[PDB]
């Protein structure tokens, strides 16, 4: 059936076996999404000019 079942093996990201801390890529993956519209604001605010 060729796909390994487990508890942490239903997700496309590692948690346990890891050199970096997991909270880094957790809050990073979510903070890039939170910082999408702020980057949108920075590019548009410089394009018309004021920031």
């Amino acid at each position: 059936v060729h796909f390994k079942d487990g508890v942490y093996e239903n997700i496309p990201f590692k948690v346990k076996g890891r050199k970096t801390p997991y909270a880094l890529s957790h809050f990073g993956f979510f903070a890039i999404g939170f910082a999408v519209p702020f980057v949108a604001c920075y590019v548009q605010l410089k394009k018309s000019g004021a920031f």
Partner: protein, 534 residues
């Protein structure tokens, strides 16, 4: 690893991919909503140095990223593709490559939308992308193209997924599950797959018409040439009200499970409720012009479209009376999904009462394009669908990902969002009855009173989301230990008054559906031999 998350055909992998896209785009949309409420805090330019066009691009990024990228891929994407085949015992969905492309079209829609926001300004149009504002003379540049392409891509995604859903629920049922004996969530996904397949192509026709009219020198909506921008409003809203009913029919299917399993008594009159769901599904196709009460219709279109939009109140009424009936006379276990479910039905009936107030075309001339309407739908979207989303996550994720959450953290998260979002969306009725118009970045200064309280409520709601995401982190790194301590709740149903605490251990789950009797996190191939049923 690439064969399981990029070439995948199994429904659960695609479902959790749907879910992580949904929560990514959901906080990407609520960041826009926070910037909106910070611009609406005090009158005058506050954070955005003028630039009202940017306020419009943030408003519609918020709207599209909250509807087409959070609520749909979190309800019919995630919960749909996960818990439809396990609750009908199907070994997979029929058409699995369809399911995989129906996921992976969505990040490309997200990419097209945010590149639209970064070229000229973004679509500064309204989520209804009404011409002649959205055409070339008023919105130059390739932004509105990329927004139309993003909406094309989510149209492709949730049409192909709806075809996948309808054939795997008409063809892949188990040995005892006839149509009457379905769970009340698969009936919900059944009916929204119907409304999706019957509603998406008029939207696709309308927006590729708008694309050709911008880009191929046509005239369907340019009145300089003979078009009509009210043909677009018909072609949009014939999709648009079936869209706002498919944003809440799976929420109804979730809440009917939650209230049953925490009342510990079945839902009162189950097939009168599937009749009510089907009646709301049909009669939502006959009410589309109630968003068009002002455009200059007949007298008797606005007499018909006022009676037909209030016969909607009867099957929704009996759904809510049936919920309160099956909660009357039970053993209410005040867990986190039950709190979310009762707050759902209370705030949804508040949004429904203000919706029936809106539904009179005699009265909607005092309320159209005001903040009364934005109160009406943020009472049934952020309190209907979002509260059903939180109830569904807190109800199913200990089964799905296998790790429990901190329960008292979940209850402060619930109470924080229930306080703060009521605090933002309650004074919108006050501003709208005083005459405050919609979609404006700057208001007259007599509206500065009830806008400060609403931006405060949005800060409470966004910090409730930050608490929820810390709850996700604590679930994903300490849920195995949330089993071993009791910062969680483990058993969904308490023992009854006379059974005792070994008999309950031999009967540890008393459910009306297969989804909890599965292995936590379930097998890659559940149901090789089929689940027999009487």
């Amino acid at each position: 690893m690439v064969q399981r998350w990029l070439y995948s055909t199994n429904a659960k992998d695609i479902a959790v991919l749907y879910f992580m896209l949904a929560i990514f785009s959901g906080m990407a949309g609520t960041a826009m909503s926070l910037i909106i409420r910070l611009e609406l805090a005090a009158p005058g330019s506050q954070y955005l140095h003028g630039n009202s066009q940017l306020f419009n691009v943030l408003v519609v990024g918020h709207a599209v990223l909250m509807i087409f990228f959070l609520v749909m891929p979190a309800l019919i994407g995630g919960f749909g593709n996960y818990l439809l085949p396990l609750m009908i015992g199907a070994t997979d969905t029929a058409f699995p490559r369809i399911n995989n492309i129906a996921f992976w079209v969505l990040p490309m829609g997200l990419v097209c939308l945010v590149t639209s926001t970064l070229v000229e300004s973004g679509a500064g149009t309204g989520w209804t992308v009404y011409p002649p504002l959205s055409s070339i003379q008023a919105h130059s540049g390739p932004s509105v193209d990329l927004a139309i392409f993003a909406l094309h891509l989510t149209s492709i995604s949730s049409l192909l997924g709806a075809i996948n859903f309808i054939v795997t629920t008409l063809n892949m049922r188990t040995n005892g599950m006839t149509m009457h004996k379905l769970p009340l969530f698969v009936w919900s996904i059944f009916i929204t797959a119907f409304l999706l397949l019957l509603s998406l192509p008029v939207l696709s026709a309308g927006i590729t018409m708008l694309l050709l009219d911008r880009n191929f020198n046509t005239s369907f909506f340019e009145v300089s040439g003979g078009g009509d921008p009210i043909l677009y409003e018909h072609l949009f809203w014939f999709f648009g009200h079936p869209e706002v009913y498919i944003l809440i029919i799976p929420g109804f299917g979730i809440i009917s499970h939650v209230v049953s399993t925490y009342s510990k008594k079945p839902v009162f009159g189950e097939i009168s409720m599937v009749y009510a769901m089907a009646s709301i599904g049909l009669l939502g196709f006959l009410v589309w012009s109630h968003h068009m009460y002002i455009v200059g219709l007949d007298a008797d279109t606005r007499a018909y479209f006022t009676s037909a939009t209030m016969i909607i109140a009867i099957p929704t009424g009996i759904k809510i009376f049936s919920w309160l009936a099956t909660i009357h006379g039970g053993s209410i276990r005040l867990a986190t999904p039950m709190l979310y479910a009762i707050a759902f039905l209370f705030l949804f009936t508040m949004g429904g009462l203000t919706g029936v107030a809106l539904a009179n075309a005699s009265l909607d001339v005092a309320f159209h394009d005001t903040y009364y309407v934005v109160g009406h739908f943020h009472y049934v979207l952020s309190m209907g669908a979002i509260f059903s989303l939180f109830a569904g996550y807190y109800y199913w994720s200990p089964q799905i990902l296998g790790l429990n959450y901190n329960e008292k953290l979940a209850q402060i998260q619930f109470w924080l969002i229930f306080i703060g979002a009521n605090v933002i969306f309650f004074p919108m009725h006050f501003l709208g009855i005083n005459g405050m118009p919609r979609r404006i970045p700057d208001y007259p200064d007599a509206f500065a009173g009830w806008n400060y309280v609403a931006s405060i409520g949005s800060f409470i709601a966004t910090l409730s989301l930050f608490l929820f995401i810390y709850i996700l982190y604590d679930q994903l790194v300490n849920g195995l230990n949330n089993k071993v301590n009791n910062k969680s709740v483990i058993y969904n149903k308490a023992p009854d008054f006379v059974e005792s605490n070994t008999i309950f251990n031999l009967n540890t789950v008393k459910s009306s559906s297969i989804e909890f009797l599965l292995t936590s996190p379930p097998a890659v191939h559940s149901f090789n031999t089929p689940a027999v049923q009487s």
